[PDB]
Symmetry: D3
Subunit: 175 residues, 6 copies
């Protein structure tokens, strides 16, 4: 059973989506879902001593402009295990390009951690934290010779619009 | 596949049951199985800085009075990963109510760790450890405004009887 | 040497104080400084499966109404090692009594983590996090039969006033 | 779906194989795949305070002389999670017997960690590391009264031959 | 300040002694106190993938037949940091010889963990645990070519007698 | 006692030096020795989600052109604790500038880990590992607006010469 295809995008789209976590915060190993089987697979070991600053995964039943499931980053105090489902509230979106591809990523908080009850938009996140995430994506592939361009951060409304676009793109590609 | 439905309750019930672990000891995140997919799902982050004192999960193909699979707590020296199957020997049962529901939980040791070879009943467990488990369940939802009531501990014999009842309740509902 | 006596209270009191950390966030072991040697010493293992929600220590060259150095709690994203000095900005104070003693504790953020640059007062802290800290101190000695009473939280201004008093109390006693 | 039966042995066998990891480096718990449901199962807790010195698993769709899937050991700098697939390059083979059975194990490195780009054969591995692996297997069941016999190490060519033999054995047994 | 020389052996010898921890449970690095400065020093990395099964250290102001401070092993549920003092109750003693030297080690529990309130003698410890400790010391230096002989376990009374002997030996050597 | 002033540079300089570790591998917290009390102090939290790729510290009784003790990086398989002394063999040197200052750093391996017995010079280190260390230092202060310049790597002979120069500089400054 491939979780990417089997799970709905969320219980109350786009206000609450499912995040299917692939990479826990603190990992230098970059995991992805095997397309065929839906098992966790090692994509690569990051070439530099950086760690994922957030729990990182995908939204089920989405497709994006870069030809992959739509990425989501969830701020967790204690990281989860790979292949864990988290009910997440989108609060913003990171706009970036990776080798000419649109590789934007939703930023979200868990609905069921009261610590984040008042985080509802991109302005609620400490600025240094947004910078640390952006810097990670700016440099994590530098030793692989890849250039990424960070364009900036969009707000919750923009994140939600993009989620709806990605849901539609999945329906068209696979429907 | 959904492990809860596919696995037998145990290889030698009720002396040895399977525990399907959801939450490793040391976790502040509370995980459950997604009913539709069988994937691990975050239920909540505990509101207080407490950690699960035991590896926590369910016995497959059981059903209990609180409308859930029968809970089991396994004492592991090194915690396992979520969705790991452990062969476990029941040694007692924690009697508690949660918001008016009978929410009893089996206490068990792993068959394949020789450290626990001589643990066969509730009297073999250090008292302080039983107290720490009871205290966790007494207080872990306090900030959510929920009230739990700890009745006490039953012995291995009582635990095994409850397991049999839960196995029967499952067959009846499904 | 005994760090408690040798270090100044801070580089810019009371806006920036030194926190000498005894217990990293995540610890169930409660450490204290040995008075005679200044070495880290195990005070006790918490009776319940709770972990310190903050990096916990003392402000050097302070003394408080409960006959101990003034306690300080520092919010660290990655916990430090015991006996590490942190430059900390006080942002509030937890008011509590422990067995009849005024056992108030400063809440502070590290000056050198830009994540907390905009945390300057108690109102900047998520409410759930204040609750989790208060709940820990309310219940962490329950199984030892001790009673703690949480009064509430004071703001940064009140915290800084108490720090000044504690600095004065130290000079007076020593 | 049982991953052992569902996954191919690898993408470019025998030069690159899939390792399906059961036990991460550092574990004292010995896990195995429940060959009924494909779930991870605790086989035992090692009787001694030893930890697995490598990420340990199996090559899918293989069968070996000892009546189990072919074992594979992958050298990872950061351990992976159980049930993770790693693309691995075989560089040697540990020859050992366990209770009279031929219990040989492939030694491999991850293709996607550049740290190991120049490890291509058994001679590239520090001698002390080979010794630590062999010692683990020599002694890890001593308190269980089990007897193992370490014969030595074979090179990459020998490992690859054995992988092909194990792939053929699976086909004959299950095909 | 050298903690080995500055701290008393304990607050209520020999019923309660100080354990000065050098190596936390779970470490493959073997630490010791630098004789000159009293700082922690790496002695060696264990040649095999074994971890210390107990928090390991010394009793201050003791000297033993093997020309070192008297060793103590403390059973802790959560390991402490190196150079931490633990008030410990001796419950037994491991009798062993290392290359002809008497290298006996006290086994103790922390006074301030109620989990161990009823552990007062060697018979209170699960047998498998005693075996795992003995096996560790039997094999941890095998790849270094060293032979150790495990002679057995003595009870709490014997442990206490040896503590008193070691305290006297320190007074004579340094007094 | 301040360990920086109290400890000798090493037991057989410059072939074997003491590394006094301040920051264990894997730390995002940057620690330094309070050169007043000798206690560990938090210098900063790195602004980016990078971790120290090596155990990092200083050689006691040295002084360098940048007005601080001579830096040393030790490759450890299992990280040590802060303020631990490691006996280390220099195998190379990283040449870099930080804010116009000569901020060179010794690269070394532990003498007492047999894994590294055959690492004796910079050419023995996997190229990808040298790159990951250099990249860390190139970028770890980028969000602080600081500029570093990585010049390259020198061999063991050059490292040893520099160690002797730093020992002499300390003597002239403090002796
Ligand atoms: Ca993408
Ligand atoms: Ca229940
Ligand atoms: Ca106090
Ligand atoms: Ca085999
Ligand atoms: Ca000894
Ligand atoms: Ca420098």
């Amino acid at each position: 059973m491939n979780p990417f295809h089997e799970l709905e995008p969320g219980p109350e789209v786009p206000e609450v989506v499912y995040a299917l976590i692939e990479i826990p915060k603190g990992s230098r190993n970059k995991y992805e879902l095997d397309k065929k089987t839906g098992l966790l697979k090692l994509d690569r070991v990051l070439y530099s001593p950086f760690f994922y600053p957030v729990d990182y995964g995908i939204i089920p039943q989405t497709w994006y402009d870069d030809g992959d499931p739509f990425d989501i980053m969830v701020i967790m105090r204690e990281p989860v295990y790979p292949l864990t489902i988290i009910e997440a509230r989108p609060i913003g979106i990171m706009k970036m390009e990776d080798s000419g591809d649109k590789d934007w990523k939703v930023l979200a908080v868990p609905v069921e951690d009261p610590y984040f009850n008042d985080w509802k938009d991109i302005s609620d996140v400490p600025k240094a934290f947004l910078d640390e995430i952006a810097h990670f994506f700016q440099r994590y592939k530098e030793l692989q010779g890849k250039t990424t361009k960070i364009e900036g951060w969009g707000n919750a409304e923009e994140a939600k619009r993009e989620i709806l676009r990605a849901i539609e793109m999945y329906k068209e590609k696979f429907g």
